[PDB]
């Protein structure tokens, strides 16, 4: 039930392009491995894991029907990091840096969504 829209193509070709290459992207390109990291409480706190590797694949595979779905996955990723981790943890500053770039890129997105 997926579509290609102008906003989803923008989120793929402009927003994700910028975030995927960023120096702080590496913890977020793939799901958190709570076993490997030794975080037995991770999945007790985070009930909807999300990462940029999953988002990127959904964009590539036209999984989304509408840009809001992709925006929601980005918000889940960032909030998940802020909820699980502590405010002074490095990972949170990395996530906030990525969120700043996300927001700056989204600010130039077409304001109206249309299928292509």
């Amino acid at each position: 039930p997926g579509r290609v829209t102008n906003q989803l193509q923008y989120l793929h070709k402009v927003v994700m392009k910028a975030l995927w290459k960023h120096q702080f992207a590496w913890p977020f390109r793939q799901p958190v491995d709570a076993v490997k990291l030794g975080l037995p409480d991770y999945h007790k706190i985070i009930k909807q894991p999300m990462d940029m590797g999953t988002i990127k694949r959904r964009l590539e595979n036209n999984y989304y029907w509408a840009a809001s779905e992709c925006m929601q996955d980005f918000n889940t990723m960032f909030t998940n990091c802020y909820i699980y981790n502590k405010p002074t943890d490095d990972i949170v500053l990395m996530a906030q840096t990525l969120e700043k770039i996300f927001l700056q890129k989204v600010a130039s997105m077409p304001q109206e969504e249309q299928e292509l």
Binding site: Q23, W26, P27, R29, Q30, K36, L37, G38, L39, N85, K86, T88, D89, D90, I91, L93, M94
Partner: peptide, 15 residues
């Protein structure tokens, strides 16, 4: 493995 608290110690995915 990496530390969430000290994540910036690592420049790339350490696995």
């Amino acid at each position: 493995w990496y530390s969430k608290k000290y994540a910036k110690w690592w420049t790339v995915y350490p696995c």
